[PDB]
From a paper:
Each CTPS monomer consists of a glutaminase domain and an amido-ligase domain connected by an alpha helical linker. Glutamine hydrolysis in the glutaminase domain produces ammonia which is transferred through a channel into the amido-ligase domain, where it is ligated to UTP to form CTP in an ATP-dependent process.
The individual filaments that pack laterally in the bundles closely resemble the corresponding single filament structures. Ura7 formed very similar bundles in both ligand conditions, with adjacent filaments staggered relative to each other with a half-tetramer offset. Although at lower resolution, the Ura7 structures appear to make the same lateral contacts as substrate-bound Ura8. Ura7 bundles in either ligand state are very similar, and at our resolution appear to maintain the same lateral contacts but with a slightly different helical twist. Regardless of nucleotide pools, bundles could therefore remain assembled to fulfill their role in the starvation response.
Numbering used by the authors:
A (entry chain D), B (entry chain B), C (entry chain A): 1 to 273, 276 to 299, 302 to 443, 455 to 572
The structure:
Amino acid sequence: MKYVVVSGGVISGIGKGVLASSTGMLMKTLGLKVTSIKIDPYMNIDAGTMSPLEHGECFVLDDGGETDLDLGNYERYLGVTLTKDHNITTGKIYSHVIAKERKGDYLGKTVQIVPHLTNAIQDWIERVAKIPVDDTGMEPDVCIIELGGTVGDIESAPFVEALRQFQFKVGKENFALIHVSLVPVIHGEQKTKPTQAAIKGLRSLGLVPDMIACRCSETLDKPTIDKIAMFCHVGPEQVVNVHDVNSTYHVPLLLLEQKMIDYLHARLKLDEITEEEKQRGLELLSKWKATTGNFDEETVKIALVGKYTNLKDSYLSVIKALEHSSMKCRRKLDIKWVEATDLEPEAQESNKTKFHEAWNMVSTADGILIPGGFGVRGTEGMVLAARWARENHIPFLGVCLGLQIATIEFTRSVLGRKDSHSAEFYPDIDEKNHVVVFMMRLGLRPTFFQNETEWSQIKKLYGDVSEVHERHRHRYEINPKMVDELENNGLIFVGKDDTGKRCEILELKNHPYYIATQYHPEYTSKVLDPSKPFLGLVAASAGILQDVIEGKYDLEA
Amino acid sequence: MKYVVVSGGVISGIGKGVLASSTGMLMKTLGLKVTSIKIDPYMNIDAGTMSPLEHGECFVLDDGGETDLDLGNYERYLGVTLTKDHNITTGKIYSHVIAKERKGDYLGKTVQIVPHLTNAIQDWIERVAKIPVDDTGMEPDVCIIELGGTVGDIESAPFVEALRQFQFKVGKENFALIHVSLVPVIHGEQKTKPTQAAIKGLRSLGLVPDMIACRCSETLDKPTIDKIAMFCHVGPEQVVNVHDVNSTYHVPLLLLEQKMIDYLHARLKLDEITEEEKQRGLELLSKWKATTGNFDEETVKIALVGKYTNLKDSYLSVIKALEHSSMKCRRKLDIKWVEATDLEPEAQESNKTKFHEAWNMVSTADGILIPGGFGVRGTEGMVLAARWARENHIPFLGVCLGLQIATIEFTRSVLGRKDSHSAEFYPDIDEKNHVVVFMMRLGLRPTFFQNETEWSQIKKLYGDVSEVHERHRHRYEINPKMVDELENNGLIFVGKDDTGKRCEILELKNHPYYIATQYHPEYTSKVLDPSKPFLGLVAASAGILQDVIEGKYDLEA
Amino acid sequence: MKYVVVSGGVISGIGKGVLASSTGMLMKTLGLKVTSIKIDPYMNIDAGTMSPLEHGECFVLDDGGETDLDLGNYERYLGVTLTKDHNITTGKIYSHVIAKERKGDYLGKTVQIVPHLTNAIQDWIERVAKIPVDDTGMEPDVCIIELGGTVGDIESAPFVEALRQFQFKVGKENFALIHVSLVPVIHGEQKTKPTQAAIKGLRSLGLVPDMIACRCSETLDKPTIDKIAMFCHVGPEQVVNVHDVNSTYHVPLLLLEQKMIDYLHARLKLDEITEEEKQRGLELLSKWKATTGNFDEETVKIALVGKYTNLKDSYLSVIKALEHSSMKCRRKLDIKWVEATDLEPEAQESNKTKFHEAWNMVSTADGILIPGGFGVRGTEGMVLAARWARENHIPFLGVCLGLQIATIEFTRSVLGRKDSHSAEFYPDIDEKNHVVVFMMRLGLRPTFFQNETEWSQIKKLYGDVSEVHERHRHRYEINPKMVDELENNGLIFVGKDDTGKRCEILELKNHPYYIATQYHPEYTSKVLDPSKPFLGLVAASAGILQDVIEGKYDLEA
Ligand SMILES: Nc1ccn([C@@H]2O[C@H](COP(=O)(O)OP(=O)(O)OP(=O)(O)O)[C@@H](O)[C@H]2O)c(=O)n1
Ligand SMILES: Nc1ccn([C@@H]2O[C@H](COP(=O)(O)OP(=O)(O)OP(=O)(O)O)[C@@H](O)[C@H]2O)c(=O)n1
Ligand SMILES: Nc1ccn([C@@H]2O[C@H](COP(=O)(O)OP(=O)(O)OP(=O)(O)O)[C@@H](O)[C@H]2O)c(=O)n1
Ligand SMILES: Nc1ccn([C@@H]2O[C@H](COP(=O)(O)OP(=O)(O)OP(=O)(O)O)[C@@H](O)[C@H]2O)c(=O)n1
Ligand SMILES: Nc1ccn([C@@H]2O[C@H](COP(=O)(O)OP(=O)(O)OP(=O)(O)O)[C@@H](O)[C@H]2O)c(=O)n1
Ligand SMILES: Nc1ccn([C@@H]2O[C@H](COP(=O)(O)OP(=O)(O)OP(=O)(O)O)[C@@H](O)[C@H]2O)c(=O)n1
């Protein structure tokens, strides 16, 4: 096997993940089977305790674990299904060694941070790097290991020990390291010294960088590359630079044009790794040239309406799912961020100025999106945003709480029933629009189209396939008692579960595009294969939905 | 409250504990209420998993937890009952913060090594420093904090962060630090540089030493003190030196004569802390002058016979209990270490040379001691050592497995019954000398003298008090069915438990001193109050037992 | 005596000098006698070898040494005459200890970087801090020590050793340190970690900061101050911040409003230092409020015409002399930078675009300034700039080479004599406008007004005083043979030397303001007392020269 560490810097937030999965996207250009592990220095075992206000969205796996949010950036860049084990954390590995301590697997020795815990970390990395995350069941050929925090943190010290020892447990010419570092510009001059002091830190703990990659406000000057390479064990051609680019999807072409892989090919001796891989490599490059061409080659404006949209990382997957689809439509994406509570009739006396800004965004947008918010607060405004797109023929997608609110609105305006509300307003009883279903429903579950719905815009985007598979995170579903009334009035539930009891998709009959999903489709959007409910929202906002379904926008003929 | 850190060095094993409890023994000279916490960098939560072969003896508390062995050094030096919480460990504190993470006590924040875990360590130290470990229920006035490992270890990095922040959570003029450091002598010259490089390490993590204390092969030269104080923020009078001394019990007088406390009095402003304390201070000095005088002011030879006596830390408490008692008898202690298996009739053909060395030690000794060994291996030789002291009137003490073997021997030689054995040889059934009693029996439990036994040598040493309280660690007891036969033949069980079913002490009727205890009395021996079963063993080995009971050797008239 | 170190950072160029002399300007607000030392890590003994292209202008002392350029920033901020010894450099101190090594002043000991060279640095700082640099001959009360480079450089390591030892040779409560450090803003967030890593570096070498001062793109957030003070031994009120301000002369008011001195008063216990000082303190504050008011309370455009004006530090003193004077005139300064060679008739075919930009600047400006350039290259354009201000009544000042070019132009256009040139064009002989006078003429020399010249605008600005004292740097003077012809034609030499042979000032008779000086007056401009030849240039460019001479712009009535 081969391995690539990505680590480093004098600051957290320097750029690692885009240098990580982006390096891993280019390993796939070579045809390689590829995987990724994110080592987190924080002490949470999983994101299941972490509220979406800090550390952001609880990204959800095929295996239904609530992981680190960043893992998602690797399931888009590489096109892989990761597992709950691919997110190593400081709380996860202290728990695993402490479990073995009380089980007595150390044969009554004292157990130490070195060597026992640093062995555990190496034994975890080489365990997880066997798992076949890729489009065929063979073990990966390269693993990208991203070390979070900064080298020289008292929180990241166990992992730089474990990785140093791993440079020997794995050989040189099988392991390599990319160190990501800061070139601050002040008084209009690129200063090298934070890279010198952080490389001094790196060699102290015993890792040696095979590349340096700079966060800089500028293109690195020719002398800045020379004054970094005069102070580190790299040639001047391995001081990589992730400068400003037209969009984040260009970074793997930037790295490849900086000859980043033409070194890793030699430095990891990758001639030592079938025709299927060689072909899938060339196809991945062709599909990259296609999505890149679709950026160079008109705007679509979408209002995303939810709770606390100020906290923009809390909707990260939704943004990326709109970006992947917008490159298929060749159209520039312009998300308007609306706080749902600023739409409310009460906000007009409380905070009038922001209420007009919110309503201008809703009124301007070519599509509306209710994104599957957290908790009840935004609901009253999200109803009025769903009403705005039901009545006037604006394209719409509701995700999770958005299907809940598409159904509350269609109840509250088409059936009358003005008292109806989410099951969250428990003591109203008779007018609850939803029912509890704890089984929380999580992870990849199927959904089956209702066999008559040949008219459907959404089941056309899915290619007329009989079923779909999707991620879930819900404790409530629409009350089955009401669903005949909604189906008879035209809010047709075009997809349901295995039992047929659960409301998984709706489409409003005879509207240009009004969909909702109980699942979160943004947790399976990929850059070459955009998630179909979001592709339909962009394509109908562009007024091109028919031609996307007919195939005028696939990447290769 | 006031606090004293003891930390440091370029090596583990430099001398901390003797500089720690010894500094705490002198805080008690001032009359202060005193406590101690040992911070261990290892990842075991407790010594209950740790086999006695590495990290040594599982020291046992009043509260019955199997602690770090070193805690014992503080219950002898200070005269305090500690608790399971006074041994902070890396496995204990990661478990406590990870429990709060899954309970959700962090209100859905991400939880970090800084500040959350470094707050947990400070909140633990100031929690535990409230507990009244002393001879009256008031909270302690000084806490001695010993930081294990070395500063600059990747295992000790969380604790030097937590202690730095603690220098502010507690004030300066309430916290002080003693750093213990190496002066190697090579080519006959004292080199200062390992102290310079380790003090550079110390100030990097942000602690500043109010004293330095040197491990050195010599008295520090006047220039060595000056060349350390020219490189650290200490006066030349605060470079303390724990040099070679007549015995370890002299170290608090060495520190006091080096004016160590005449600085801490000012540096912790201890004028800011009743007549009872002032008196108990002067009495502790008088009792120190007494035990010191008893060292300056003839040898007693004792054979300690057990499994794997090569592993001398595995019997540490037993050695210290013999030392405390030997200073009461004014006699020099000479422990002969015997491997019990080298006494066996089989060892004579297998390894003849060591078998003669073992038997010479047994034949020479003025007393025999079977120390409460671990597992079955040594048993056959320990029987012959008990027989040697039953028949010939040699003084004897059996501790735990030693009472078991005193009873197996008296069965095997006085009752005949040559097939009899420990309950460990389970499938013999009918001839098992013992019975299972799991309740493991642990911690401080009472023991009551049998009301007729006024003749007893051991119940005389206990001052004619009606009951005693002692630590236990046993899964087997002598089978109650047999005890009438043993009592009738003269192996009188002079002490039993609350129920009267359990065999807690035996004394053989009409022998100069042949005792065993099912408890471990070495876990309550103190330097001014020696544990009575061990005092009797030394005093009878000295042939002075009568006069020790009559009071010719108490410290003050 | 008291002392203040200014040091630090992860980068060179962070802001030290403005935090240094600015802190020293506020020590003078307290009435204190004040001095400054700049410690340079570079190996040049003096700027006399250093060409003005790199490290910039060779600033010149009262004592005529070619010093570090930065010393000037302290002679403006404090109002002091420094000496060649106030610029400590790595080349200067290795030379001084190596001289004592060959003289044998070490009594045949081996001489070492510690302690001998670190003693030399301390013995130099306390030597120089005695020298009475101030407006009365008493020794200074505070010394500001600026440590150049960055802490943790292999070039600055001898000085942080010497300063650490100096924290003891001088007492605490006599020495304090200000550490200047970086808060980079990326992704719109202020990151603290470069300050944590550089403070870790600082405490390693053993200095402790009594203040931190941040270079930041922003006002520091309340949490950024707290997260620096949680990681350093400073209160949150001693994390100072030199943010963007209207001009550099506001920084001492910014520091004073951040309560910077209200701490140093207590931290250096400055109550332990006469009515003259107390008065001169209040007067310095009043004069600061005046120059500050003159910034708050119309533009003057000046073309500065010389060689290589792209290298803007090479004219630093000239810029500051124009700033000090512009605050007296209450008018905003706008220096147009002209490359003198772009004015040439040859530049019109060679590089036409830049030639028009140069001539637009010359044609726009309210005054012309020829700044005393280095070498011959710019001369031909500087002639045409002097002609432009002779003929059209534009205000003018020529400094050094500017007097040379004022005289070459007046010769070349008023006397005819079109072949005339600087003595630099040696082989023309008969038409050389100048003569060699090596005595280089340097340092503070007098100049005496010619006793009839009562009409003069410049000798009016000097207050009708009989003589002036000024800095020089010239190897050429105007040929005395010609001076009668120039005086008779109206280029009256209104000031000459002690002998009357040397051309020190000219004024063209009956022009609104056309002055030149052979001396460099910008080497004695001060913020409360602007250098008179530059005050006249700004005041005549403002068309207010009469009223400045009559006194409509002095700071206090
Ligand atoms: N392939 C990627 C990589 C990053 N991002 C986005 O960029 C931001 C985080 O970038 P990252 O590469 O993780 O850098 P930081 O986390 O800012 O810093 P670090 O280097 O510490 O990860 C997030 O919006 C993340 O979703 C993304 O959309 N796609
Ligand atoms: N010396 C330190 C400081 C912090 N941490 C931990 O490592 C993480 C790094 O986060 P970081 O971005 O460094 O936060 P700050 O320390 O505030 O750094 P910044 O100021 O850039 O946020 C911290 O959250 C904390 O978990 C650490 O290990 N060692
Ligand atoms: N009051 C004390 C202190 C120490 N010792 C003994 O000395 C040895 C350990 O000494 P210690 O002070 O702990 O030093 P080390 O552990 O060798 O090193 P460190 O400084 O790391 O603790 C053990 O036999 C311990 O029982 C003792 O009998 N009584
Ligand atoms: N860089 C290191 C090395 C080891 N350790 C841990 O800290 C303990 C210190 O034990 P030590 O006595 O240092 O063992 P060694 O590393 O072998 O040192 P020595 O050679 O003196 O035993 C080690 O057991 C290990 O738990 C650590 O934290 N950091
Ligand atoms: N009282 C001062 C201080 C500085 N400057 C100017 O500001 C620049 C240099 O600022 P300085 O304070 O020296 O910062 P740097 O040299 O950039 O960085 P350092 O902190 O390393 O000195 C130069 O134009 C210098 O003349 C000035 O005009 N007046
Ligand atoms: N590790 C180093 C590197 C350089 N220097 C010296 O200290 C000076 C500091 O200048 P600096 O501004 O640090 O130059 P660079 O090293 O290039 O740093 P920068 O990239 O910010 O210019 C250098 O010129 C050199 O004299 C040093 O002492 N130690």
